[PDB]
Design a protein around this ligand. Sequence first.
Ligand SMILES: [Mg+2]
Ligand SMILES: [Mg+2]
Lengths: 310, 310
Amino acid sequence: AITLDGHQVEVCANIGTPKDVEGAERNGAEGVGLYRTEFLYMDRNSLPSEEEQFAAYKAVAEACGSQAVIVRTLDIGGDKELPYLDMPKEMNPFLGYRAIRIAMDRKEILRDQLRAILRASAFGKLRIMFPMIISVEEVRALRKEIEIYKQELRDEGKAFDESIEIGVMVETPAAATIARHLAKEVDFFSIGTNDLTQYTLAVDRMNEHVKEYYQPFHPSVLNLIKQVIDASHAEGKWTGMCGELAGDERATLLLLGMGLDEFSMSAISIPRIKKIIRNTNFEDAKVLAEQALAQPTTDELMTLVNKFIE
Amino acid sequence: AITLDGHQVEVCANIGTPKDVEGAERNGAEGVGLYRTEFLYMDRNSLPSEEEQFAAYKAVAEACGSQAVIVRTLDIGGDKELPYLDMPKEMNPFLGYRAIRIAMDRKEILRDQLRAILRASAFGKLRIMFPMIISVEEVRALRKEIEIYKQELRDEGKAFDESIEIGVMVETPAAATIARHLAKEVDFFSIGTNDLTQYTLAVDRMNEHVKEYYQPFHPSVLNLIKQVIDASHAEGKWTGMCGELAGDERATLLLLGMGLDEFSMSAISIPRIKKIIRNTNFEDAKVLAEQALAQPTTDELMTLVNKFIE
Ligand SMILES: [Mg+2]
Ligand SMILES: [Mg+2]
């Protein structure tokens, strides 16, 4: 989509299973900004094989023609009950043995999924996105593993996209703070704003007694987002957002002004957000974003963006 | 304590009960940078009355003579530790209904403790520090309540320090990010580094399966700390540290170079940290700190700090 003054941003669909692709196309998605892969690991008694995963990743790669699909690696933890995974009981599963920490400790899981994505990337434009990253050394280790797996596929005579792009799903405050360092190691970011908000404000939004503390428009969260966007641009990269905020019509102008390159959302929201983008002036939104992110409280920030919307 | 080139920093004791003052004095504490108040709420079947808290706060205020004592308000949650409050079970208690969130929801708890601290402030130099802060709105709501309690004390004829100082214990990435706004409305910060590390890196340090992810020297944590320090200075305020890192001889020169104004620690660590401070050049430390905080990984940061030490 393009703003009134010619600023282009991508507006993409979040997908949870290959059937969601139909709704994404129906609603004018320009691509898939988040393909969640948890459905492959749930409601079963055994890890999904490389072949089973490949079948699913290939289906989406071909379904989306020439559009890019961002595949998020396993993003699950002990809060979910999947006995075959043998996940330990945890006092704070949101801060625990989850997502990339599982895959990097149980290489079978990482290898099965990354090999499957690599093989599927021969049939469409796929990107790999890692969740729960907090450190440059995690990314460096993952890139080494990817190159090992590429060599294995070459040694086996299996095709893959040798230039597959790699990204971090920025959801920890740590990753937001070292974004400039991370932007040197990966091709893009995508902001998981729901989880970034929870970790930054130290709030589990499903906790009934503190649920009101969860505010994605909190100035700390938005300034961290701006920091990540700016870091990506300083290195010639780009930042998307697959968190719920990207599909929030109260945030579209603000996020545009912040310089967000890509919005990814439940497909039903794509036409509304597209329309806002096409009727926004980027330069004006940039001025509003600067004033908004300078406000000291959520209420004062939101009051400013809402008046500008009117 | 003063550095070789004349930079003064306070070296203070963390205490958890009036009995700890003796050891703080024994070891040369220049004041109390953290008076934990959990001992008043734990190991009992009832809330601690205002009078019981007042007795404990007054005893430390008088024991410390002319020194300042920073009293941290209730900083705990969960059923295990507050069973007489009938706390609900929580999936992620570390992100839940705890500390100031409990007190601002159950106003009797806030009122008993702040009135006791206010009354005790007539007997020595006391400061109030709030944990778990994520927003300016919370500081404003707490200041409003303090002013109500102040007027109640005036109406009852009870003395209190009318200019009692108010601070935030920075442990949430949120507070670190909005530090410049908070510095306008509070008198000081103290960094709770253990919890700031856990929230920033999204890691429960007590979780055996991810304990290796807990890294207080991680560049994101130290850069958040520097952000807090600099924000406090921009507003003519100051920043201390009562987290474990302040008692760590590996971090002293680094924290000094980052501009930390106060170190607070278990009393037995005070002589060694004082000696390092007195044998350090602040200007040289500042250069070191700038280089260290620019490093992309914990290992590169610590290696750089270690080499400078040696
Ligand atoms: Mg997450
Ligand atoms: Mg804490």
